[PDB]
Amino acid sequence: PRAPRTYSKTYSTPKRPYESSRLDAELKLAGEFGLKNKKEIYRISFQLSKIRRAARDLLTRDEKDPKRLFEGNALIRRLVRVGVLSEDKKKLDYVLALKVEDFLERRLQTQVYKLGLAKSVHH
Amino acid sequence: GISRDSRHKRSATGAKRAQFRKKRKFELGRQPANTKIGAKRIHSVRTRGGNKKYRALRIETGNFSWASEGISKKTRIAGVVYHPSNNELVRTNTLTKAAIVQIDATPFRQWFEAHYGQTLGKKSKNAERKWAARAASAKIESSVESQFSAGRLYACISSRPGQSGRCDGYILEGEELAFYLRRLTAK
Amino acid sequence: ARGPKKHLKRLAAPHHWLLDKLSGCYAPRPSAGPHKLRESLPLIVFLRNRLKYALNGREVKAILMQRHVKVDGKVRTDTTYPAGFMDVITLDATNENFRLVYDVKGRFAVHRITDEEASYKLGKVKKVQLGKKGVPYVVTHDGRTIRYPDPNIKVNDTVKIDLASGKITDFIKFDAGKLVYVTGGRNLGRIGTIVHKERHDGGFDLVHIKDSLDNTFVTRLNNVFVIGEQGKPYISLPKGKGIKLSIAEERDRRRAQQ
Amino acid sequence: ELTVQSERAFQKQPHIFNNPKVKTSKRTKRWYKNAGLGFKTPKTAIEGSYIDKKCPFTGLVSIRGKILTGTVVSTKMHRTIVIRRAYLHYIPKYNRYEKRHKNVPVHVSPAFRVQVGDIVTVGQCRPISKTVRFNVVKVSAA
RNA sequence: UAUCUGGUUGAUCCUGCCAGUAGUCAUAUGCUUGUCUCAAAGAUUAAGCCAUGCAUGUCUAAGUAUAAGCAAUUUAUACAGUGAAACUGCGAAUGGCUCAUUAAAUCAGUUAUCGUUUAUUUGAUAGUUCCUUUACUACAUGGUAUAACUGUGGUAAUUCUAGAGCUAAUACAUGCUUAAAAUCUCGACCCUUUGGAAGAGAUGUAUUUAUUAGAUAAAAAAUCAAUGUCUUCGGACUCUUUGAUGAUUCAUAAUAACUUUUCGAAUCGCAUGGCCUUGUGCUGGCGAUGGUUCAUUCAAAUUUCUGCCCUAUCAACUUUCGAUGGUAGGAUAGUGGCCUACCAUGGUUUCAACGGGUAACGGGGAAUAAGGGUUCGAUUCCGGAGAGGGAGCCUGAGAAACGGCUACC
RNA sequence: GAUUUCCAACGGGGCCUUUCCUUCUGGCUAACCUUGAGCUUGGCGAACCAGGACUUUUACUUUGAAAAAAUUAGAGUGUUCAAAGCAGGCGUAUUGCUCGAAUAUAUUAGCAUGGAAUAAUAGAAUAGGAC
RNA sequence: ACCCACUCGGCACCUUACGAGAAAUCAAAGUCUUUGGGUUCUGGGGGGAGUAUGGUCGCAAGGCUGAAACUUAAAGGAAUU
RNA sequence: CGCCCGUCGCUAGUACCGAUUGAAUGGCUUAGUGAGGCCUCAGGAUCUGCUUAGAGAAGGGGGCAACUCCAUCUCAGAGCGGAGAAUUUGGACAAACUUGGUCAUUUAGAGGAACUAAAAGUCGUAACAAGGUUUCCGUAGGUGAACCUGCGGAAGGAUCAUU
C-alpha cells in the first residue's frame, strides 16, 4: 500500500445557515456578479477568513522578528501577485480589511466583462 | 521443553502474570548432563547459531593442574568425595563442576621424581646439577605430601563438563585444602 | 520478527534520500555493507533520481553490471550497495567521480571531484587496539581496517586512505582548530572549527564548534568528522561550505539571481 | 556475618591465588577495581575479609549505566536493601503535580553500613537477581 | 472563526433540562444521479466454516550434463553450443492478512550489553597439518554410495513407493605436500667442572583449564640465592618495554598439558606469456566459489527511569509444589529462581496492591475548541500477538514456522 | 560625515566594600621584580591542562544535544483553476545551462550547562564540634 | 451593690447597602467575570428510589453503602395583578 | 362551578423475588487417566570394511614321478571395527479426556409483590385558605383507602408586640 493522498475541504458551511441578512448579502453578490449556486461564495469566504486569520496571527508577532517578517512579505507578495491586494497599499493591515469583492473581481468572467469581451456576466 | 521465561514467573508484587506469548525457540533449555563415571561417550548438541556443545557423559580421564607449582597433566578420575551443593551427586558418584574428586596422581608423582630428584615422603650429572639449581623449593606442605605418599589427591573442578565436554581441575592446597579436609573428616 | 527483514516501505525511507513520495509502493532496501542503511545512499536511487543517467531499475542494473561503475576501487555489481559518506565512486572513463558529501540542507550533494580527489580519501577512525598476534589496527568510519597504523593515531582522528595500497598516507590529530563536517544530527553538512570540547565523563561528548561567519553551535562528538586543518581543508568542499544561510536572505538572494 | 567462610563451599575471588611457599603479608591478595565516575572505594573494602562476588569493588560486576539516589526503608532482607524513590508526577490538565513513590530493591556490599533512614546512591549494574538491578556505591549516613 | 434561540408562567426574574444549529478520513438507509482527478471498501455481530484456481522457486563465462533431447564439431578423439529432469548451494524465518489474547504486559520517549549470538555483503585475517613423524604414507591430486535413467510392479485413490542394473560433485568420508632464525625442554660430550656443548624433541590455530603479566604519584642508603652484564668482581650498570575505557578477572602475549580433534583450498570459467632445455620440466593474471577468526552492517535477545480505561457492591495479596535473597551447581549463546539441594522469612500495598470488566494491540495521529479541554485510533507508517485451541519437534545462522511435520479436540 | 567624541534606557562581566568568589603534586608560568635603553631569562601552577582533598540532596527555571516519515503550520511552483503533486525554468535547442525538492511543531520521562529568587531537608548544645 | 470612660471574649438586636444575591434577605450569604487564603463532604432535569440486589452491624424493628431497566417535558425557587 | 390524592376494575410494557439438587458460554486449576515429540538406559535386526584362516582344484613358474610358489566361481570357522532401524528402562515438556471447585456475562420459569402509560370507571376528600381537626419530620401501632393516634422535634404557622 502506497502513501495516502491528502485532501482538504475548500468551503466552510456557516454556523447560521438560516437567516435573512446574510442570505440577502450573498444573493445580491451572486446576482450582481453572475455566479452559480453559492458554493464558490462559501469557498471564497473560507479562503478569505483563512488568510485574514493568518494575517492577524502575523500581526500579533513583534516587529523585526524574521519569523513574522518573511512570512509577512511572502503573504503580501503572493496576494499582490494574485491581484486582490492593492499595489499602492501593502502594509499587512489592508489584508485584514480586504473583502470578497476583489476575490470575485479576479474571476475570469468578471475580468472578461470589465475588459469588454462578452458584455454580460452570464455571457 | 524447559523455558527460561519470566512471563510464567509471578510478578514482584505477587500477581499471577497472564501468559502473553508461547514458548520461543531462542529461550529453550536442555536437560542436565549428569556426567557419570564410565566409558567415554560424548554426544554433540547443536546450539543457536552453530557452536556445537560437547554434552559429556561417563568421562574416563581428565586434565588437572598444580597452580601452586604450575604443572598440568592428564589423570584418571577415581571418585567424588563431597559436593558443596548437596550429597546425592556424590552418592550417585557423578562428576559436576566445583566437586572435590580423587585423582590418580601417578603422573604427578612421576613428574616430581623426574624433576626434583626427591620423593614426597615415600645418575645423570645434568639431572644432579638441575636439581641443585632447583633446590630450596623441594619443600612440600604436610597435607599435600601426606596425600602424595598415600596416593590419590584431592582436586576441585573448574570446567563445566556439560558445556566444555571435558573435565579440568586443580589440586587443593592451603586454606581450601584444610577447610575441605575438615568437612570430609567431620563424618 | 522471527528473523531479519528484507523489505522497507516507501514511508520509512530516510528523508535525506530525497525520493518521490509515491513512485509506486516500495523503496530500495540497502544491503549489508560499509555504512548504516539509515545514513546510506544506494546506487539505485543515486543514479536514478539524483544524477539522471538512467530511467528505471532495469537500466541502472544494466549500467552497474556492464563494469562501468568502480565504487571505491572494485567494480561492484549490487544495485543496493550502501554508499555512505566520504566515499569516492569512480564512473568509468571521462573522469566523473562526484564524491558523496552532505549539502547544507542535510541531504547529499553531487559535487564533482577530480582524479586525485578520487584516488585519495579521508576516513574517521572509531576504534583502535591490537588483535591476534598483537597487530594494531584502526577501524575507520567506512569500515575498512588498516593493519599496523601510526602509533600517534588515536581515537576520534582522521586518516588518509590511498585506496591503492590500503595504508594510511597521513593522519589528523583531534585538537583545536580542526574543520568538522558534522556527520549527522540537525547540523548536517555544517562546516566549523574545534575550539573547546567538554570532558563529559559520563559519556556522550559534545563540542561547541564555530562556523566561519560567527555561528556558534554544539554537536555531539560522535557526529563530528575532521576533514582538515583551519583554512586548509584536505577535501574538495562543495558550494555553500556549511554556511547555513538564513531563510529570508537566502530567498532574497535567489530572487535577486532570478 | 563476622566469619566470611560459613557456607558449604569455599567462596573466593576467581583466578586469585596466593603461593603457599611464600611469606608476603596479607597472604591472599585482595583484587580491587575502581568504580569510576568520581566514586571512591572505601578503606574497609581494601582490607575486608568478605568475597561478595556481586560487589563492584571486588567483583566482576560493572556500574555502567545511570546513578540514582534513594532512602533505605528495609534492611532485614539479607545482603540487600530496599530504597524508596520520591518523585512528582505532573498532570498537564490540572497544572499540578502528583505525589508518587517507587520501591526498587538494590544490592549493598558488606563494606557499606546502611541503616533505616540514611541516604544512598545506587548505579546500574547487570541483573543480579529477578528484581534487583542496582548496586550501592555511596552511602550518606544521617 | 471567545456569538445563539423556542419551551414550566395571567405576566416577571432565576435553577434546570428538552429541542433546534454546525462539523465529523463516523457509519447505515431513502430519493435521484450528466462530466474531470482521486479514492475507502466483510472492523463493528461469526479470530465462524470453506467448494474451486493462484500466491517460492532458482544457472552464470565461472558446482555436477553419455537425456537413447536439439544441432553443429572442421578449435579439439575424453568433454565443450543450447539444453528436459535430477543431485548440489541458497531462499521459502521476506512479503500479505486480522487485532482474538494482552492493562507495568505490549508500546512510546529514553539507556546498557564490561551479560550475548549473528548467514548475509564490506575490509583484513593460517610457511607449522607426515606425530616408532628410515616407509607407517596416492599429493601428477586418492576412497565410496547414490539421484535422474533403463526394465518389474502394487494401489480405487495422494507432490505414494519396493525390489535389479548402473554411473559424477562445490555429495559424504579420508589425506600429506615449501626457506629459516629466535625461544623452551631433555640431554650426551668435554668434566679444566669460570664451565661451556654435539645432538634430539617442542615451538600456528579452535576448545578446556591454572599461573605470570597486562604497568605507568616524587626523591635516598646498607646488604643477599650464584658475581648476571664486564672487570683492579673495587665493582660501573645509567638504559630498563607495555594499548584502551570513568571503570575490569579488558583486548593481547608466554608457559604446563587436553581434545569422540575445528581450520589451515583433494573446487570452477576464460586469456595466453617467460626460464633453460626442447621436459606436456619449471615459473606465470582476471576472477568465482569455499574457508579459521576479528571489525562493520543486517539485525535478534533481554534491560535502566517515566508514562495506560473504569471499578473498594475487590482491603490485604504472595509465601504447600517458588514466593523475597544468598551459597554452590545445571541449562541457555549469554545476566537472571530460568531450574536444582541447603539456609534466612522475607517482597508489594489507602501514594489504590490484589481481584473484576473492557463492546481495550499500543504509538505516530484523526475529529472538535479563544486558551484550557472532550472523543476516537482495527485500518495505507513503526513495534507486538496470531494462521482453529493448545502442546512437541527436525531442518535451518535466524521458526515453537503451520501455503514444515507429529499427538488431542 | 549610515558612522565615529557622545551625552540617556536596557539587560551582562570583573574588582574593592570583614564576602575563598572549593586547592595541592608537575609540565609553562599569568597578570612578568623577568631590564633589554622600555620583546629583556624565573613576577604567584591555571592565563593552558594532567591529575589528585572534598563535593548535602533537591523541587524549579533558561539554554542545548539527540529526537524516522506521512500527517500539522507553512516557503517556492500555471498539475488549464483547484483538490494536487514535488516538479520545473531558460536556450545559441547541430551543441546545453540550471534554481529546488524549505523552515518550524515534538507534551511527559532521560542527559549536560548559569541561579540560589521561592518551597523542604542536615549541620556545633549532657559537644566524639572545626581547625 | 451601683454610675462614667476604655478593652477582650460571647448570646444577640436596630437604620442603612461601600457590596452580594433571581428575589425573599445577608455586616455575613461581602472582599466571586477586577474570577486563586488552606481544607473536608455533597448534587447534575422530575419520577423510578433512598427501591432491588451485593456487603456490613443489630435479639428484634431496622442502621450504613447503594443501582439499573422504564417513563415525562416540564417538575421547581423568589416576587407581581 | 379550581387544583389534587389514595385503594380497587380493565389493557400493555419494564424491573425484582421465585421451587426448578436452575440450565448453557468463557477464564483459572483439585485430583485421576493420559497420546505425542525431546534428552538419556539398552537393544540389535540389516548393511559393510580389515586381518588371518581352511577350501575342492583350472593355468602358469618349477621340479618335470609325486610334490612346491600364486591369486582366481565358492563355502566351515576366528577376531578387529563403522553406520545402524523396529522396540524400549528412566527424566522433563506435558496436548487431551473424566470428575469437581471458583470467578465474569447471559436467559426459561407457575406464582407473588411494585413502577409506568393513558379524553372520559367505582369509593372517600387526604393536601393547597385557620382546606374547614394548623402543617411537616423521626418512632410504634390500627383501619379498604387516602389516613388516625401516643411520644419527641421544626415553622417551611395562622405568632417578630406585654416594662
Domain boundaries, chain A: 17-123
Query: Is residue C233 in some structural domain?
Result: yes
Q: What sign results for the dihedral spanned by CA atoms C63, C64, C70, C75? A: negative
Separation in Å: F40 C1' and C175 CA: 33
Question: Which nucleotide, over all strands, has the C1' atom closest to the CA of B3?
Answer: E338
The C-alpha of A81 sits at a distance from chain C's nearest C-alpha, in angstroms, of: 15
Q: Determine if strand F comes within 7 Å of the CB of C244.
A: no
Contact partners, residue C33, CB within 8 Å, separation at least 6: C40, C81, C82, C143
D71 sits in which H/E element: strand D67-74
- Compute the half-sphere exposure of residue C117: CA atoms within 13 Å on the CB side of its CA: 20
Pair C131, C228 in one domain: no
- Residue A66 contacts C, CB cutoff 8 Å: yes
Subunit contact D21:B139, Cβ cutoff 8 A? yes
Pair C155, C219 in one domain: no
- Residue D34 contacts C, CB cutoff 8 Å: no
User: C-alpha B126: how far from its chain's center?
Assistant: 36
Subunit contact B68:D12, Cβ cutoff 8 A? no
Query: Is residue C12 in some structural domain?
Result: yes
Pair C149, C184 in one domain: no
Pair C183, C161 in one domain: no
- Residue D20 contacts C, CB cutoff 8 Å: no
Cβ neighbours, 10 Å, residue A85 = 20
* Residue A21 to residues A16, A18, B144, Cα–Cα distance (Å): 11, 10, 116
Pair C74, C43 in one domain: yes
Question: Which nucleotide, over all strands, has the C1' atom closest to the CA of A75?
Answer: F75
Please give the resolution of this entry in Å, rounded to 1 decimal. Answer: 3.4
Number of independent structural domains in chain C: 3
Q: What sign results for the dihedral spanned by CA atoms C140, C146, C147, C152? A: negative
How far apart (Å, rounded) are the C-alpha atoms in residues A33 and C213? 56
User: C-alpha C93: how far from its chain's center?
Assistant: 23
Using a 7 Å CB cutoff, list residues 37-96 of B near strand E.
Answer: 41-51, 53-55, 63, 65, 67, 70-74, 83-86, 96
Closest CA relative to residue C157, chosen from C207, C196, C122, C121: C122
Nearest to A66 among C10, C11, C248 (CB): C248
Bases of chain E below 7 A from a protein C-beta are 1, 3, 21-25, 38-39, 92-97, 101-106, 111-115, 117-125, 186-191, 193, 197, 205, 207-212, 225, 243-249, 251-253, 255-260, 287, 293-307, 317-318, 322-342, 344-355, 372-374, 380-386, 390-393, 395-401
Nearest to C22 among A3, A66, A73 (CB): A3
DSSP alpha helix (H) spans, D39-114:
43-46
Question: Between β-strands B61-65 and B43-47, what pairing exists: parallel, antiparallel or unpaired?
Answer: unpaired
Q: Which domain holds residue C134?
A: 121-171
Query: Is residue C249 in some structural domain?
Result: no
Is the Cβ–Cβ distance between C35 and C86 less than 8 Å?
no
Query: Is residue C150 in some structural domain?
Result: yes
Separation in Å: E150 C1' and D112 CA: 87
Interface chains of chain D (3 or more CB pairs under 8 Å): B, C
Q: List residues bridging with C159 in a β-sheet.
A: C123, C171
Q: What is the DSSP letter of C47?
A: I
Query: Is residue C104 in some structural domain?
Result: yes
Question: Between β-strands B168-171 and B61-65, what pairing exists: parallel, antiparallel or unpaired?
Answer: parallel
DSSP chain A: -PPPP----S----S--S-SHHHHHHHHHHHHHT-SSTHHHHHHHHHHHHHHHHHHHHHHSPTT-HHHHHHHHHHHHHHHHHTSS-SS--SSSGGGT--HHHHHHTSHHHHHHHHTSSSSS--
* Residue C18 to residues B83, B115, C44, C54, C175, Cα–Cα distance (Å): 67, 77, 13, 17, 35
Pair C10, C76 in one domain: yes
Closest CA relative to residue D81, chosen from D136, D125, D128, D141: D136
* Residue C68 to residues A27, C91, C217, Cα–Cα distance (Å): 70, 6, 42
How far apart (Å, rounded) are the C-alpha atoms in residues C41 and C106? 13
B115-119's contacts with Cβ under 8 Å and 24+ in sequence apart are: none
Q: What is the DSSP letter of D38?
A: S
Cβ neighbours, 10 Å, residue C130 = 9
Strands (E), chain C: 41-42, 69-71, 82-83, 89-91, 121-130, 136-140, 145-147, 158-161, 168-172, 178-180, 206-211, 215-220, 226-229
Query: Is residue C253 in some structural domain?
Result: no
Q: Determine if strand F comes within 7 Å of the CB of C251.
A: yes
Query: Is residue C185 in some structural domain?
Result: yes
Query: Is residue C252 in some structural domain?
Result: no
